[PDB]
XYZ file of C-alpha atoms in Angstrom:
372
model
C 82.627 125.875 94.788
C 84.191 124.025 97.846
C 85.428 120.469 96.961
C 84.698 117.269 98.984
C 87.269 114.427 98.520
C 86.713 110.879 99.674
C 89.865 108.694 99.966
C 88.850 105.209 99.050
C 90.581 102.268 100.760
C 92.656 100.259 98.272
C 91.285 96.719 97.633
C 94.237 95.782 95.301
C 96.002 92.987 97.264
C 99.271 94.385 99.176
C 98.560 97.788 97.884
C 99.830 99.911 100.963
C 100.282 103.268 99.250
C 97.643 106.107 99.322
C 97.008 108.813 96.864
C 96.533 111.362 99.747
C 98.715 111.251 102.949
C 97.924 112.658 106.243
C 100.237 115.703 105.555
C 98.516 116.490 102.155
C 94.994 115.991 103.761
C 95.993 118.601 106.230
C 97.210 121.036 103.558
C 93.952 120.527 101.575
C 91.674 121.167 104.543
C 93.621 124.446 105.247
C 92.638 125.314 101.637
C 89.011 124.714 102.373
C 88.637 121.154 101.072
C 86.440 118.745 102.967
C 88.095 115.394 103.258
C 86.673 111.884 104.112
C 89.126 109.108 104.614
C 88.226 105.399 104.672
C 89.828 103.277 107.404
C 92.234 100.957 105.434
C 94.021 98.146 107.453
C 96.329 97.591 104.316
C 97.454 101.251 104.268
C 100.961 101.771 105.563
C 99.430 104.914 107.207
C 97.665 104.634 110.584
C 94.048 105.889 110.535
C 94.710 108.144 113.344
C 97.160 110.257 111.527
C 94.483 111.270 109.095
C 92.148 111.801 112.139
C 94.754 114.219 113.624
C 95.135 115.942 110.192
C 91.321 116.697 110.296
C 89.767 114.114 108.035
C 86.323 112.667 108.775
C 86.913 108.942 109.248
C 84.626 106.514 107.494
C 84.291 102.694 106.916
C 86.213 101.042 104.024
C 83.906 100.794 100.940
C 81.783 103.763 102.233
C 82.304 105.665 98.932
C 79.862 103.383 97.225
C 76.953 104.969 98.953
C 78.572 108.548 99.288
C 76.674 111.664 98.085
C 77.152 112.161 94.298
C 79.083 115.301 94.584
C 81.971 113.690 96.459
C 85.043 113.225 94.367
C 86.309 109.653 95.101
C 90.004 109.455 95.008
C 92.156 106.306 95.234
C 95.405 105.020 93.731
C 94.773 101.630 92.236
C 92.015 99.729 90.468
C 88.602 98.640 91.367
C 87.903 94.941 91.983
C 87.036 93.465 88.480
C 84.437 91.374 90.265
C 82.394 94.580 91.053
C 80.062 95.481 88.120
C 77.850 98.194 89.500
C 77.578 101.578 87.845
C 80.266 104.125 88.709
C 78.265 107.402 89.516
C 80.971 109.691 90.978
C 83.852 111.630 89.506
C 86.891 109.241 90.275
C 90.582 110.056 90.473
C 92.777 106.906 90.326
C 95.168 104.940 87.977
C 92.581 102.776 86.180
C 95.049 100.997 83.671
C 92.459 100.750 80.928
C 93.802 103.304 78.317
C 96.415 100.707 76.932
C 94.148 97.835 75.711
C 94.769 95.869 79.050
C 92.545 92.709 79.349
C 88.993 93.868 80.299
C 89.506 97.550 79.578
C 86.035 98.081 77.894
C 84.285 96.614 81.026
C 86.106 99.008 83.246
C 84.929 101.977 81.081
C 81.317 100.449 80.834
C 80.886 100.905 84.619
C 81.428 104.777 84.394
C 79.387 104.994 81.115
C 76.461 103.254 82.704
C 76.706 105.382 85.877
C 77.334 108.657 84.168
C 80.607 108.838 86.239
C 83.889 110.499 85.265
C 87.408 109.061 85.446
C 90.462 111.473 85.814
C 93.181 109.033 85.355
C 96.354 109.672 87.437
C 98.635 108.250 84.745
C 97.605 111.038 82.328
C 97.645 114.111 84.518
C 100.208 116.295 82.747
C 101.097 119.856 82.998
C 100.822 122.181 79.882
C 104.144 120.928 78.387
C 102.882 117.367 78.798
C 105.032 116.303 81.628
C 103.276 113.940 84.109
C 102.593 115.896 87.300
C 102.744 112.753 89.575
C 104.704 109.447 89.154
C 106.602 107.064 91.466
C 110.258 107.295 89.913
C 112.337 108.336 92.788
C 111.528 105.464 95.162
C 111.509 103.022 92.498
C 115.193 103.882 91.978
C 115.799 104.182 95.787
C 114.216 100.634 96.494
C 115.919 99.140 93.447
C 119.401 100.220 94.499
C 118.685 99.038 98.116
C 117.836 95.604 96.826
C 120.998 95.517 94.426
C 123.174 96.340 97.260
C 121.469 93.569 99.372
C 121.817 90.984 96.709
C 125.473 92.025 95.998
C 126.191 91.724 99.725
C 124.295 88.459 99.944
C 126.633 87.028 97.310
C 129.686 87.904 99.397
C 128.348 86.075 102.581
C 126.518 83.037 101.137
C 127.276 80.284 98.742
C 125.920 80.329 95.264
C 123.389 77.606 96.054
C 121.539 80.142 98.094
C 119.423 83.179 96.717
C 118.348 86.464 98.321
C 115.423 85.762 100.746
C 111.833 87.199 100.347
C 111.661 90.974 100.898
C 109.016 92.978 102.530
C 107.879 96.538 102.588
C 109.550 98.725 105.204
C 107.826 101.385 107.533
C 110.192 104.294 106.658
C 113.402 104.860 104.714
C 115.710 104.911 107.811
C 114.642 101.333 108.559
C 115.516 100.356 104.955
C 118.922 102.115 104.943
C 119.879 100.551 108.397
C 119.133 97.028 107.053
C 121.071 97.547 103.664
C 123.990 99.097 105.602
C 124.097 96.046 108.003
C 124.175 93.590 105.089
C 126.705 95.838 103.256
C 129.184 96.020 106.320
C 128.914 92.245 106.714
C 129.954 91.879 103.061
C 132.842 94.209 103.596
C 134.159 92.134 106.708
C 134.754 89.297 104.418
C 137.314 91.236 102.374
C 134.967 92.108 99.428
C 136.134 95.615 98.234
C 133.615 98.421 98.115
C 131.464 97.782 94.938
C 131.381 99.867 91.905
C 127.990 100.681 90.592
C 126.877 101.653 87.171
C 123.615 103.388 86.889
C 122.101 104.086 83.380
C 119.570 106.875 83.585
C 121.287 108.766 86.457
C 119.449 112.193 85.794
C 115.800 111.069 86.098
C 113.978 110.645 89.293
C 114.645 106.878 89.635
C 118.251 107.539 88.825
C 118.426 110.234 91.638
C 116.665 107.772 93.927
C 119.211 105.151 93.227
C 122.116 107.529 93.881
C 120.562 108.817 97.110
C 120.272 105.313 98.608
C 123.972 104.539 97.676
C 125.253 107.640 99.369
C 123.081 107.034 102.394
C 124.392 103.449 102.638
C 127.955 104.773 102.466
C 128.913 103.718 98.907
C 131.549 106.350 98.009
C 130.537 108.797 95.294
C 133.769 107.747 93.321
C 132.460 104.129 93.109
C 129.243 105.255 91.196
C 129.393 105.564 87.428
C 126.492 107.948 86.480
C 125.458 107.489 82.939
C 122.648 109.062 80.936
C 121.846 109.496 77.222
C 125.204 111.247 76.659
C 126.822 107.909 77.213
C 124.321 105.317 75.880
C 123.814 106.982 72.521
C 127.403 105.675 71.851
C 125.302 102.371 71.399
C 125.779 99.052 73.119
C 127.036 96.614 74.247
C 128.863 98.443 77.064
C 132.056 96.998 78.515
C 131.380 98.976 81.704
C 128.487 96.777 82.586
C 130.279 93.390 83.143
C 133.077 95.439 84.897
C 130.716 96.895 87.558
C 129.880 95.067 90.588
C 126.244 96.303 90.413
C 124.246 97.708 87.391
C 121.185 99.717 87.969
C 119.145 100.428 84.751
C 116.540 103.241 85.048
C 115.850 103.880 81.359
C 112.948 102.336 79.417
C 113.929 101.616 75.813
C 111.544 99.592 73.659
C 112.854 100.224 70.131
C 115.021 97.728 68.083
C 118.511 99.178 68.970
C 121.795 97.437 70.064
C 121.364 95.976 73.556
C 123.311 97.300 76.622
C 124.726 93.761 77.206
C 123.940 90.300 76.255
C 124.797 86.615 77.121
C 128.058 86.805 74.944
C 129.550 89.747 76.892
C 128.425 88.245 80.186
C 129.916 84.760 79.502
C 133.322 85.703 80.689
C 135.504 84.599 83.576
C 136.818 88.289 84.024
C 133.320 89.478 84.625
C 132.927 91.282 87.954
C 129.154 92.015 87.635
C 127.150 90.196 90.342
C 123.723 91.946 90.355
C 121.343 93.710 87.756
C 118.506 95.856 88.954
C 116.292 96.630 85.922
C 114.246 99.413 87.531
C 112.539 99.806 83.985
C 111.820 96.078 83.764
C 108.782 95.238 81.545
C 108.170 91.645 80.585
C 105.916 92.835 77.575
C 108.835 94.918 76.133
C 109.423 93.634 72.512
C 112.994 95.127 72.512
C 114.409 94.587 75.874
C 117.925 96.305 75.944
C 119.017 93.943 78.705
C 118.058 90.618 77.084
C 119.216 88.280 79.698
C 116.024 87.428 81.683
C 112.451 86.602 80.832
C 110.942 86.513 84.455
C 109.632 89.577 86.293
C 110.702 88.964 89.888
C 108.547 89.622 92.951
C 109.085 90.413 96.663
C 108.559 86.850 97.746
C 111.348 85.819 95.366
C 113.219 88.996 94.439
C 116.066 87.712 92.107
C 116.425 85.330 89.108
C 119.675 83.705 88.001
C 121.195 84.708 84.729
C 122.453 81.437 83.443
C 126.032 82.262 82.525
C 128.638 79.707 81.261
C 131.623 81.665 82.831
C 132.248 84.132 85.607
C 130.613 84.390 89.051
C 127.039 83.910 89.768
C 124.924 86.725 88.302
C 121.393 87.645 89.134
C 118.540 89.884 87.880
C 116.035 91.919 90.028
C 113.160 92.753 87.772
C 110.377 93.775 90.286
C 107.941 96.142 88.563
C 106.425 97.533 91.851
C 109.627 98.791 93.512
C 107.928 101.883 95.055
C 105.869 99.463 97.387
C 109.186 98.600 99.233
C 108.809 102.136 100.886
C 105.051 102.771 100.601
C 105.071 105.795 103.065
C 107.875 107.840 101.426
C 106.460 106.773 97.928
C 103.008 108.206 98.996
C 104.352 111.342 100.493
C 106.323 112.265 97.299
C 103.531 111.259 94.804
C 100.901 113.175 96.862
C 103.058 116.248 97.355
C 103.698 116.295 93.454
C 99.835 115.777 92.865
C 98.744 118.483 95.373
C 98.979 121.641 93.061
C 96.723 119.891 90.541
C 94.340 118.898 93.437
C 94.087 122.566 94.390
C 92.691 123.295 90.898
C 89.758 120.754 91.415
C 87.272 123.607 92.157
C 87.964 124.655 88.539
C 88.052 121.215 87.012
C 85.482 122.103 84.391
C 87.951 124.596 82.855
C 91.600 123.979 84.156
C 93.362 122.204 81.237
C 95.127 119.683 83.585
C 91.620 118.150 84.476
C 90.115 118.994 81.076
C 92.804 116.996 79.240
C 92.073 114.121 81.591
C 88.318 114.345 81.148
C 88.511 114.710 77.283
C 90.779 111.700 77.151
C 88.318 109.638 79.262
C 85.589 110.653 76.740
C 87.673 109.608 73.769
C 88.489 106.153 75.129
C 84.681 105.876 76.028
C 83.805 106.670 72.443
C 85.922 103.553 71.257
C 83.456 101.303 73.353
C 80.989 99.859 71.012
C 78.200 97.863 72.893
C 74.683 96.849 72.221
C 73.774 97.945 75.876
C 74.526 101.536 74.846
C 71.917 101.636 72.095
């Protein structure tokens, strides 16, 4: 009945997060788990932390020849160039349940190997809430970058953009950098910014608020909006009037937009920076219809081409957690831990059964001559 878990090294480029951290490895061993951890030079964690936490350290890629009873756990996808049979039970985000390009081939690997995929994205408690997601640090990182861009606009001319950003080793280091930029902006005479957050009550919302407090933005300067306020229906006057607008709500139905080029095109607009934490380029009904580009760490902002008012930019990065890969891992892995403790009963425990049955359903959709 004792479970062996094998933490696969991520092979997705620049993926520095991990599904189990040294702290959660340690708790799982205390609970009688046996844990192997692959050496991962891309991981934000040093291998030696897992060593001290009691893991058995093995080479990157060693899961491929591991005994068939080991549960292989990772965060992100397999190399699409690998085509060999998946024989193990795997725990990971596989991004193949939503008709993604190549989704059938993903599943064909498991089918051919008689392996099982328990998809992280669809582990839910009995009320159907996801047990583990990356919201909080998405909102934290997003806010951090909106302050940096707002501050950047106070200290540089419009013909310059916020430079390339990089992941940080810990939250303290991010806060200190944001704070430095921010104090420099205030030294020019800029007043302390007001920030509108839409979706203030979810985890991303709370992350954004937490960042602003820690940077020193007065609580009075933060307009904390959720459904109560947005159901009134847009466009919202409060958006061009804020210095920074952080959106944390995903909306994809044909409703009235939060704002538009018409409301933005105005010499009295104070808004300098929009961080769309929910940004999704494939949203048919983007409620902030002012940008088409999904921005990235090497080029984190895109101009909104206004015809009046100060220079205005959008941050639409869709991997904001990756700015703080250590804290993002810790929180995700902590939240995932009670479900991992149920792995000895995964044949019957609904959290695991839901994920297995769902795998089988998506598998049934795959119609291939090679299965005859």
